A paper describes a structure:
It catalyzes the conversion of two molecules of putrescine (PUT; 1,4-diaminobutane) into one molecule of sym-homospermidine [HSP; bis(4-aminobutyl)amine] as the main reaction along with several side reactions. Bacterial HSS is NAD+-dependent, active at neutral to basic pH with an optimum at pH ∼8.8, and shows increased activity in the presence of 50 mM potassium ion. The cofactor NAD+ is bound as a prosthetic group in the binding pocket with its nicotinamide ring being part of the active site.
To experimentally substantiate this interaction, the tryptophan residue was exchanged for residues with reduced aromatic character (W229F, W229Y and W229H), for both acidic (W229E) and basic (W229K) residues and for alanine (W229A). In conclusion, the decreased or abolished activity should be caused by the exchange of Trp229 and not by structural perturbation of the binding pocket. In the W229F variant, the location of the Phe229 phenyl ring is distinctly defined by the electron-density distribution. In conclusion, we suggest the weaker cation–π interaction in the W229F and W229Y variants to be the reason for their reduced activities as explained in the following.
Author numbering:
A (entry chain B), B (entry chain A): 3 to 477
Amino acid sequence: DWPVYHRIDGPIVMIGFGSIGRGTLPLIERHFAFDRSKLVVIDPSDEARKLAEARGVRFIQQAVTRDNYRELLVPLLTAGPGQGFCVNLSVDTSSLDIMELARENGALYIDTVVEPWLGFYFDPDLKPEARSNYALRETVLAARRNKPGGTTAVSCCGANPGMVSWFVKQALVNLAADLGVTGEEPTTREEWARLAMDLGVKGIHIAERDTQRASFPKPFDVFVNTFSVEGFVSEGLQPAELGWGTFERWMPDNARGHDSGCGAGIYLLQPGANTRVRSWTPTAMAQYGFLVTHNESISIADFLTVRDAAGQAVYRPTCHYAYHPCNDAVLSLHEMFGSGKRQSDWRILDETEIVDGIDELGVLLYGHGKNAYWYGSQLSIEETRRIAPDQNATGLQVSSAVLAGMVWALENPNAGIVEADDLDFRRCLEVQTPYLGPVVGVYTDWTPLAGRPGLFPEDIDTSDPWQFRNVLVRD
Amino acid sequence: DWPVYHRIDGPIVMIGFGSIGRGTLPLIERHFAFDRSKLVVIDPSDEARKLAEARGVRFIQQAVTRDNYRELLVPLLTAGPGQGFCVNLSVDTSSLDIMELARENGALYIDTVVEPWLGFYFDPDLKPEARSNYALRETVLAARRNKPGGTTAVSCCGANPGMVSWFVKQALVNLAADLGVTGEEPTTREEWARLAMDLGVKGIHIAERDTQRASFPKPFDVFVNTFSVEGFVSEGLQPAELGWGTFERWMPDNARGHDSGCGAGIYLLQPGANTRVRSWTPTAMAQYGFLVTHNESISIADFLTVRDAAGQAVYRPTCHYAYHPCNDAVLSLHEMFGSGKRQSDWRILDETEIVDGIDELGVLLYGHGKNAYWYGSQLSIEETRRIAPDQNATGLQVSSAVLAGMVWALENPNAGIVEADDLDFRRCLEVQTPYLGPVVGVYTDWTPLAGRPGLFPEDIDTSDPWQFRNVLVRD
Ligand SMILES: NC(=O)c1ccc[n+]([C@@H]2O[C@H](COP(=O)([O-])OP(=O)(O)OC[C@H]3O[C@@H](n4cnc5c(N)ncnc54)[C@H](O)[C@@H]3O)[C@@H](O)[C@H]2O)c1
Ligand SMILES: NC(=O)c1ccc[n+]([C@@H]2O[C@H](COP(=O)([O-])OP(=O)(O)OC[C@H]3O[C@@H](n4cnc5c(N)ncnc54)[C@H](O)[C@@H]3O)[C@@H](O)[C@H]2O)c1
C-alpha cells in the first residue's frame, strides 16, 4: 500500500547506476506510474550493467561525455509522448550542461551535486578558488539569472545537500515554538532569513555521524565508504569551505573570500577531508567532524542572509559540514592522507556487509537562547532493510530525498532552476519521512569550549563559545 | 630446550601485573633458575590477584605509593638470601624513588619507563616543560651524578624505550658497511656519536606500525589498545617531544627548549597523541605517525651527540617517535580527542581476541648517502603464540627486552644507573632475538617531500626533504 504520487508521461533517463542510482530506481518504480519501457539507465560500468540486467531495466553502457551528451540525451529525453525526467546520479558529468540541455528540451531534471565534466577537479591550471563548490554553485545561479522560469530543474537535492535544507526550516519553526513564539510561519526567503536572525541563530553545522560497521575488518590499501568513494575523495580534496556568518570575528590566515557571487562563502587553502572541527550529535555526543565542502554550506547561508536597503548583508549564519564518517572511512582517510595518494582499490559497503549502525544526519543550530538544537534523521540499517531494498542507510536518506524532489518537480513543473532551499519543505518531508526512521529534535548544553582550555595554552574566545575560532581544530 | 642464563638466589619483586607483567613473568620462570616461592607480585587490582593466584605465585594486593613504598618494599627487597631483583612494570609509581630505594638496599632494578607518582601527569599547576619526558629523565641523570656506580639499575628497558637503542647501534653498523665507511666498531659513547656524524645521519624515527586486528569491531566509548591504555593515554597527553638535531633549520612557533639538562630536546605545546608526522615503515610504506613523547627520543639524541672541546654540541640527530598504532587505537584516539575526555571504559586486546597482524617496530635512520634505512622487528601474532604465552606481539617485544635487560644486569651488577643505550647491545639482542621474529634492514627512497607540493600551497623546505618542517603535519 505504498502511495503512487504522480504519473510520468515521458521517458525517465537515469544517468549513473552506482550506490545512489541503485537505491533510487526501486523508489521510482514504487512511487510513480509509467510504462516499464520508458525508463532507461546509462552507466559505463560492467558491474552496473549486470545489476540492471538482473532488475530487468533498460541499460545503455556508455559514459556521458562533453562530446556525446547532446547526441545521446536529446533523443532519449524527447522520446515522448510528454514530459520526461532526467535523474542525474552520476560522477564525472557536468550537472550544469545536462541541466541546461534538459531544460532546452522541456524535460524535468534533478541531481544531488554540482558536478563538473571529467578532468576538472585535478586540473593543475585551476586555482583553489576555482575548485570550490561556491564557484560551481555560481554557475547554476548565473544560468538561472540568464533564463528565469521555464521547466523545473532541481539542483543538489540529495540528503546533504538537499534534505538538510528542509531540516533547517523545520528546526527554525521548532525553535520558535519551543520559545513560545506562535503564528506566522515564514513563506518567503526574506521571512525565513529574518526568523533565523530574530531567533539569534549564529550558525549551523551539518552534524552527521555514520556508525555503520562492516562484517569484515578494513583491508589494508583499500578505501572503504558507505557511498561513492570517488565522489567522497573528490570532495574531500576540494578546499575546506563554509558559509560565513556575520557574528564571526576571526578566520585563519589561510582563509580566503570571493570577489564575486552571492557573498556568503569562504574557503581554506587546505583539503576539507583533512580539516577537523569540534561538533556534536545526539548519538556521538561531542566528536570531531571533517570540514568537507558541500553545496548546502553556501546555499543555506545565502538563503538565510538578511540585507539592508543598500544591499549589504547585516545578518548571515555560519554554515558548514561537520562530518564523522563510518569507522572504516575514518581509517581510510588516515591511510590516504598519510600515504599521500589514493589507495589502489576501493569498495562501498553493501547492506549485506553491514552488521549494524545508523546514519545520524541532522542540522545543529547554535547561538540562540537554548544554546544548540540538533534536528534530523537517525535511520538504522535494520529499518532500511525492512522498507527499501538495494541500499544501506546512507543511500536511503539520499534516494528518498531524490524521490521527494521528483515529486515536487512533477507537482511544480514550471518553477525554473531551483535549489533545495526553494522547494516546499513540508511537502518534501511528507514524501521523504517514511524513509528517514526516527526524526527528532534534541537540545544540548555542549559548546566547543566544553573542557577548555586544557593543559596547553590555546587561542580561544571565551566570550562567544561558538566562534569558528573555537570550533576549528588547530595546533 | 630454552636457555637458562642464571640462577637468581634472592627475592624477585614484580611491581605491577598488567599486560607486560603477565608476559614477563613466564619468561622469567623460563630463563632463570630460582625457587618459585621467592617471587612476589604487588598490584592493587583484583584481576591481577586472580591471575597470580592461578600461577601459585605470592601476591600482595597493594598500590605502591609515596606514603608506603619504603615500608612496603624494603623487607621484600632485603629478604635474601641473595641479591634481590626489583622488576617494575607498574603505572602510577615513581621509577626514580623505587630505583633509589633498590640501590640503597643492594637490589637490582629494571623498569620500562620513567613514571612519576600518581597525580603528576594531570597536576594543573605544572608548567608544560615540567610535564615533559626530558624533565623526568633529567631526574634520573641527576641521581646518577649524585651517586655514581653502585648497584645496577636499568632505566627504560622495554621495546621502545629499550630495544630500539640496540637497533640503532646495529643499524649504524649496517650503514657503515653498506656506505663503505671504514673503522673499528665503536665501543664508547663518543665513538658511537662520531660514527653517526660520519655517516651523515641527520635523524632517526622510531617508526612503528601495529597491524594487529581484533575479532570484534571497536565498541563505542571504549578505548582499545594492545598495551596499557592508562599509560598510553598519559604519554599521549604529555607535550609532543623530540630530540632536536643540529641539521634542523626550523621549529614551529609553539616549540620550546630547556634551560638546563643535557640540551638534546624540544617539546611542543600540544599533546603528542594528537600530533601527526610523516614517516615510513616496510609494511606500511608512507604513513602518518603520532609524535608521542618517549624517553628514547631524548636518550638516543643525547647518546649520539658530538661536542667540541668547549662543550658545545656540534652534531646531534633528530630523534622522535612516529607511531601508527593498531586501527582500533587510531579510532580510539579520534574518539578521545574528538570528545575532549577519556572514554568511560577501556580494554587491552588479548592474544585470544587478535585475528592477525604484526607489531612492526624499528628505527628509520635518514639523511645519509642511501637516503633512509629501516631496521627492526616484524613480529607477528602467530609467531608470538608459538613461542611465548599470555601476551600479544606488542607485549612480547617489551617482555623479551626486560628479559634481556635482566640478563645483562645479572652479568653486570655493579654498573650504576644505566639506560638501554649504555648496555652491551649485542648481548641484549642475543637474548632477545629469539622472541623478535623477522629482524630486517630495508632501504627506501621515500622522503617526506614525496608527492609534494600538491593541490595547495605548503610551508615546506625543498632544499632538504628530511627537515622537521616537512615531517610535521599542520592542522
Ligand atoms: N547530496 C547528497 O546527499 C549526496 C550523497 C551521496 C552522493 N551524492 C552524489 O551522488 C552521486 C552518486 O553517488 P554514488 O554513491 O552513487 O556514486 P558511485 O560512485 O557509487 O556511482 C557513480 C556511478 O557513476 C558512473 N559514471 C562514471 N562516469 C560516468 C559518466 N561519464 N556517465 C555516466 N555515468 C558515469 C559510474 O560508473 C558509477 O556507477 C555522486 O556524484 C555523489 O557525489 C550526493
Ligand atoms: N618501553 C616500552 O616499550 C613499553 C611498552 C609498553 C608499556 N610500557 C610501560 O610499562 C608499564 C606497564 O604496562 P602495561 O601494559 O602492563 O600496563 P597495564 O595498564 O596493563 O598494567 C598496569 C598495572 O599496574 C598496576 N598498578 C596501578 N597502580 C599501581 C600501583 N600504585 N602500584 C602497583 N601497581 C599498580 C595496575 O593495577 C595494573 O595491573 C606502563 O607504565 C607502560 O607505560 C613500556
